[PDB]
Structure 1
Amino acid sequence: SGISLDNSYKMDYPEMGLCIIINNKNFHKSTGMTSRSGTDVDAANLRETFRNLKYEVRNKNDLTREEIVELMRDVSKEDHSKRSSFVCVLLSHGEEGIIFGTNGPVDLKKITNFFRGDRCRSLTGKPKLFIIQACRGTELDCGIETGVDDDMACHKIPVEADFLYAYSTAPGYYSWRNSKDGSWFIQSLCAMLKQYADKLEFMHILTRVNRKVATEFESFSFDATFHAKKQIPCIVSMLTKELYFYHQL
C-alpha cells in the first residue's frame, strides 16, 4: 500500500472499551467524611457522555476500599483483546495520591498498577485513561484578576507507558463541587467531550476543559477562607500517540 504513519492510537477495534465509573457518595460514619452532594449528577453526565462515544459503561456506587481493589483486579483480568482502550473514572474524596473508599483510603498507584503494560497484557500498547475528581490536598487558589542504549534487538516499552491521568485539580489543591450541578471539572469535561470528541485530539479537548474550569468558575462561601477561589485541572500524560475518539469508516 502507500505511505503509512503511526502517530495515533488504533481506535477501530470492535469495541471502544470499558468505562468504569466509581461513584462514591456516602461514607461510613466512622471515617468522618461528608456526603458528596452532586456526585450523582456527575455520574449520570459521564454515563451519557461515554455512552455516546460508544464505551461500555459500568457504574459502581459506594464501594469500600476492599471492593475498589477487587473490582480493579477483576477488570484487569478480563480479556480486552477486542477493545481499543480503557477508561476509569473515580469520583470521591481524596488527598494527594489517594482516593477514598467508603471506609478508608486506596493508593491511586495500587489501582493503576493492575493495568501496567506487563500486568494487563490485552491492554499493552492501548491508551489507559484515569479521570479523577477528588481533592489532592488542602491548598486554595486565590486567583488573579485578568550505542549500548540504542537499537535493542527485542523491542520493549515501559510498563508505565500509555497512561493518561486527567486530574480535576493541581497537585496539593482542593477540588470543587457544586451540590446541584456536580463538580466543576466533570461538568466541563462532559461538555467539552460532547462538543469536540468528533473534532479534536483528546489532549486538545482536555486543554479546553482546563480553560473552561479556569475561567468560568469561582467559589462563593460565607466563610472568607473558602470564598472567591479558583481551580485549574492538571493533565498528566504518558501517552505515546495522539488519541482520537473517532476513526475513518
Structure 2
Amino acid sequence: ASGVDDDMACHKIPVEADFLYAYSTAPGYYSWRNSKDGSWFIQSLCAMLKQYADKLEFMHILTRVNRKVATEFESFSFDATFHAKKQIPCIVSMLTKELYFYH
C-alpha cells in the first residue's frame, strides 16, 4: 500500500510528543489536600515510587497511585458540602515509549 501521509523521507516527531502529565484529579474536579499529611495524590505518588520505581514501568506505577487514592482516601469537612468526597488521579500520556527509572 501507499499514501500521501506516511513514510516521510525526513523523520519528524510531534512537538507535543514525549510529555506526560500526572494530574492529581479528574478534569473539572477539586483536588484534595490534608492540612497535616499533605495532598492525597503526592502522598500516594511518593509511596508508590518508593515501592515500585525499581520494579514497574511508570504507567503501571501511576495506575497503582490511581487505585491508592481512589480507595484509601475520603474527605472530612465540617462543611457538609465538602464532606465524604472522593478523588481519582488522572494520567495523561503523550509518551511514545515505556519508561523505567532503572536500567
TM-score of the pair, normalised by structure 2: 0.97
Q: Secondary structure at the match of 1:149?
A: coil
Alignment partners' CA distance in 2, 1:181 and 1:190 = 12
Match of 1:229 in 2: 85
- Can you give the 5+ residue segments of structure 2 that lack an aligned partner in the other structure? none
For 1:19, the equivalent position in structure 2 comes to none
Q: Which has the higher strand share?
A: 1
How far the C-alpha of 1:245 sits from its partner, in A, is 0.1
Counterpart pick for 1:190 among 41, 46, 55: 46
Instruction: Kindly state the Cα deviation for residue 150 of structure 1 after the two structures are TM-superposed.
Output: 1.0
1:111-136 Cα distance to aligned partner (Å, 9 max, x none):
xxxxxxxxxxxxxxxxxxxxxxxxxx
Structure 1 residue 222, shift from structure 2 partner: 1.2
Residues 201-233 of structure 1 deviation map (CA, whole Å, 9 limit, x = unaligned): 000000000000000000011111000000000
- Identity of matched residues, %: 99
The structure showing larger relative contact order (alpha-carbon pairs under 8 Å, at least 6 residues apart) is 2
2:58 maps to: 202
Secondary structure of 1:185's aligned partner: helix
CA–CA separation in structure 1 for the residues paired with 2:4 and 2:29: 43
* Deviations 1:92-115, CA, capped at 9 Å, x for gaps: xxxxxxxxxxxxxxxxxxxxxxxx
User: Offset of 1:169 from its aligned partner?
Assistant: 0.2
Runs of 4+ in 1 over 6 A off after TM superposition: none
RMSD: 5.0
Query: 1 CA distance for matches of 2:52 and 2:78?
Result: 37
Alpha-carbon deviation of 1:236? Answer: 0.1
Q: What SS class does the counterpart of residue 69 from structure 2 fall into? A: helix
* Structure 1 alignment gaps of length 5 or more: 1-145
1:155 to partner: Cα distance: 0.3
Q: CA deviation at 1:174?
A: 0.3
Structure 2 CA distance for aligned equivalents of residues 196 and 230 of structure 1 = 24
**Distance in 1 between the 2:102 and 2:16 partners?**
25
SS at structure 1 position matched to 2:13 = coil
